[PDB]
């Protein structure tokens, strides 16, 4: 218990019912004192893998570093940098940009994607 | 909340109404005008315990109009929403006291029959009704507020006489005004409105109550 840990429990968004591919729903077994998961339309039900079944209020993370295939690098209108070393491949031609989205990113900071073959890496400095 | 600051509200509203009474011409003591919150707690011996009867303690008679008709009364109901039951007991108290005027200050809502009974009351007697939150701030302290003086019937008589003014011609003033409620002005009566003038230096107008 210290202000240096983090909370990435790996939430389970959904599990389909094997009888119908429909979503399984939480439930207690008050008799066995255990959480269970059930489908509504059918009698299929199965125990839970974790006590956490819900999460709320989102987006306080670095989305823009994700959801970006390096294939953007083929766009000529996206500027290469003279700044070398693909955080992986020892080669320049890193492609760079802001977040450029909704949070459009008060972060005007450049984000770098190497365009050199065999890396595809998306970082920033 | 409702632990200490409330006393400040009860103090400030007490001064606001006293200044109001004082403004009505009633000879409020300067010390009552002058008293502090610390003194206010001291004057009422306030807060020996919580959930007491300050509103019963706040309840007071007002006494003055260089014209000795004497005896105006102010009562603060303990219930937020006041019912006819308290109004009848109040009616009994004002009758038994034979006061000339009763001011009752309600915290929240009222039954419409009590509201009715308050409106009618008696053809020869007046009952006054003020909401506590509206009392919580003296609106006449505001810079936009002109000086309002109630005019005697003779002044009104003289006013009409000097101009040959028709009653209709006079601008009306709605009795739905909080300030109208403040003066306790009645329908047909005239209030003297004193304004600064950027042209004259001084401007005086009048409005009859409707």
């Amino acid at each position: 218990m210290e202000p240096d840990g983090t909370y990435e429990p790996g939430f389970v968004g959904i599990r389909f019912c094997q009888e119908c591919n429909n979503m399984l729903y939480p439930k207690e077994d008050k008799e066995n004192r255990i959480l269970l998961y059930a489908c509504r339309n059918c009698d299929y039900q199965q125990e839970a893998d974790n006590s956490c079944i819900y999460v709320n209020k989102i987006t306080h993370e670095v989305d823009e570093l994700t959801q970006i295939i390096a294939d953007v690098s083929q766009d000529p209108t996206l500027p290469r940098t003279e700044d070398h070393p693909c955080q992986k491949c020892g080669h320049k031609e890193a492609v760079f940009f802001q977040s450029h989205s909704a949070r459009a990113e008060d972060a005007m900071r450049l984000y770098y994607v190497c365009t050199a073959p065999h890396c595809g890496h998306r970082w920033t400095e | 909340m409702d632990d200490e600051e409330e006393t400040y509200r009860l103090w400030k509203i007490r001064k606001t109404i006293m200044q109001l009474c004082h403004d009505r011409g009633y000879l409020v003591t300067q010390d009552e005008l002058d008293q502090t919150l610390e003194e206010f707690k001291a004057q009422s011996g306030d807060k020996p315990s919580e959930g007491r009867p300050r509103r019963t303690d706040l309840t007071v008679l007002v006494a003055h109009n260089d014209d000795p008709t004497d005896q105006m009364f102010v009562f603060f109901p303990e219930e937020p929403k006041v019912g006819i039951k308290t109004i009848k007991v109040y009616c009994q108290r004002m009758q038994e006291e034979n006061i000339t005027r009763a001011l009752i200050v309600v915290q929240q809502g009222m039954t419409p029959s009590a509201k009715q009974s308050l409106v009618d009351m008696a053809p020869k007697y007046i009952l006054e009704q003020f909401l506590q939150q509206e009392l919580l701030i003296n609106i006449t302290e505001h810079e936009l507020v002109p000086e309002h003086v109630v005019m005697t019937k003779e002044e009104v008589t003289e006013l009409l006489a000097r101009y040959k003014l028709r009653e209709n011609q006079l601008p009306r003033i709605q009795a739905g005004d909080p300030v109208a409620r403040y003066f306790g002005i009645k329908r047909g009566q005239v209030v003297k409105i004193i304004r600064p003038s950027e042209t004259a230096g001084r401007y005086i107008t009048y409005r009859l109550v409707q």
């Binding site: 295939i69 294939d71 953007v72 083929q74 766009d75 | -």
Partner: protein
């Protein structure tokens, strides 16, 4: 585009657009679309002689 450049594809009609951001390629050959002629630059140079 090379078919487009070969005139085997109607440049005056056929529009062809790709968005890496969407991972999409959209094409439109409907009427009422506005187009204009442009010089084709290759290797930061003009293709004309």
């Amino acid at each position: 585009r090379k078919l487009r450049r070969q005139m085997d594809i109607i440049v005056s009609e056929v529009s062809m657009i790709r968005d890496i951001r969407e991972r999409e390629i959209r094409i439109y050959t409907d009427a009422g679309r506005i187009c204009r002629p442009l010089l084709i630059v290759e290797k930061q140079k003009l293709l004309l002689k």
